[PDB]
């Protein structure tokens, strides 16, 4: 059944919640963002009410085939009202189209879900600081102090200096970039940028970008392998086998393979920097795992509570085992102490 932290109290809303058949008394379903944990159960038969981004949206009709009277897109930054309710979309900072929902509840509450999100000290200037946020619907994903990673910026500088390093040491060098959902798209447009290139994929995965509102997206990708030397494939096809096997299917034009698995966490992060990692390397095909996170790093996470200053926080991941339930409150707990609320 739709566990309790999926529903907004003194609403009939849901957030993320299309997984449980009809949720009795349910009169909106909002969704945070394009992954398919979060949408897993929607299709072109659902029939009430879907509230998100004009990005969201976009990938709702053409991926999921939603019949366009059930989506109701939102701009951002906007108080709108929906079924009685004041509610405000703010960007999660997560993937393209990724909000975080503001909820102003008849009785005076207000509630904050992240949805998922990589908290940013930008959102202590948005719409948030106009007003005190009592309940807090929390992405944990990485709420325990190993969790340390770099900056976006610092991870795609590194991505961009090895493979312009790569490619004009060797001219006949390949660079295959891994996905298996949106997000993470300045790793491989960053990279194609430094080399002039176009970046190409499959006709599912082009189609997909072009649900995105990237600007000058016509400019940046192809569906054309050929004359692309930037490759994106399935994170599955992203190791020696896969990659030994792509480079047959491009006809002796390439000798050697520079590929890149944008990962989130791995443990070579408590002891690893960025100017020092290396790749697994087997004959001509070498691979480097980036610690690329579109979730907030533990410290990150803790500044973004600390400013918030809430009353009440609902983890919406992590929540399966007592053992990280009970941890989580622990630090949340440090969190209220040390600063004071
Ligand atoms: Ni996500």
């Known amino acids: 059944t739709c566990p309790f932290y999926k529903k907004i109290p003194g609403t009939g809303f849901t957030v993320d919640a299309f997984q449980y058949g009809v949720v009795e008394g349910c009169t909106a379903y909002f969704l945070t963002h394009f992954?398919?944990?979060?949408?897993?159960?929607?299709?072109?038969?659902?029939?009430?009410?879907?509230?998100?981004?004009?990005?969201?949206?976009?990938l709702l009709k053409n991926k999921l085939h939603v019949q366009?009277?059930?989506?109701?897109?939102?701009?951002?930054?906007?108080?709108?009202?929906?079924?009685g309710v004041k509610v405000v979309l703010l960007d999660a900072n997560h993937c393209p189209?990724?909000?975080?929902?503001?909820?102003?509840?008849?009785?005076?509450?207000?509630?904050?879900?992240?949805?998922?999100?990589?908290?940013?000290?930008?959102?202590?200037?948005?719409?948030?600081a106009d007003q005190k946020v009592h309940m807090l619907y929390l992405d944990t994903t990485y709420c325990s102090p190993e969790y340390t990673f770099?900056?976006?910026?610092?991870?795609?500088?590194?991505?961009?200096?090895?493979?312009?390093?790569?490619?004009?040491?060797?001219?006949?060098?390949?660079?295959?970039?891994?996905?298996?959902?949106?997000?993470?798209?300045?790793v491989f447009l960053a990279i194609a940028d430094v080399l002039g290139s176009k970046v190409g994929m499959s006709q599912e995965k082009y189609k997909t970008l072009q649900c995105l509102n990237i600007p000058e997206i016509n400019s940046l990708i192809t569906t054309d392998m050929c004359s692309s030397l930037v490759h994106l494939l399935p994170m599955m096809q992203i190791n020696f086998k896969?990659?030994?096997?792509?480079?047959?299917?491009?006809?002796?034009?390439?000798?050697?393979?520079?590929?890149?698995?944008?990962?989130?966490?791995?443990?070579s992060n408590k002891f690893t920097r960025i100017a020092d990692v290396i790749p697994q390397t087997k004959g001509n095909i070498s691979i480097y795992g980036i610690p690329y996170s579109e979730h907030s790093s533990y410290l990150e996470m803790k500044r973004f509570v600390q400013w918030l200053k809430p009353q009440k926080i609902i983890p919406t991941v992590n929540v399966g085992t007592w053992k990280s339930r009970?941890?989580?409150?622990?630090?949340?707990?440090?969190?209220?102490?040390?600063?004071?609320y």
């Open 35 to 58: 992954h398919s944990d979060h949408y897993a159960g929607l299709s072109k038969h659902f029939t009430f009410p879907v509230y998100c981004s004009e990005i969201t949206g976009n």
């Open 68 to 83: 366009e009277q059930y989506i109701h897109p939102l701009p951002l930054d906007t108080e709108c009202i929906v079924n």
């Open 97 to 128: 189209g990724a909000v975080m929902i503001l909820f102003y509840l008849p009785n005076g509450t207000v509630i904050l879900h992240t949805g998922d999100f990589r908290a940013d000290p930008s959102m202590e200037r948005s719409l948030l």
């Open 150 to 186: 770099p900056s976006q910026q610092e991870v795609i500088r590194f991505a961009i200096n090895t493979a312009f390093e790569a490619v004009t040491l060797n001219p006949h060098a390949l660079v295959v970039c891994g996905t298996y959902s949106i997000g993470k798209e300045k």
């Open 242 to 267: 896969g990659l030994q096997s792509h480079l047959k299917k491009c006809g002796g034009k390439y000798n050697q393979i520079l590929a890149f698995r944008p990962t989130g966490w791995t443990h």
């Open 326 to 340: 009970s941890t989580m409150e622990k630090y949340f707990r440090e969190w209220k102490l040390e600063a004071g």
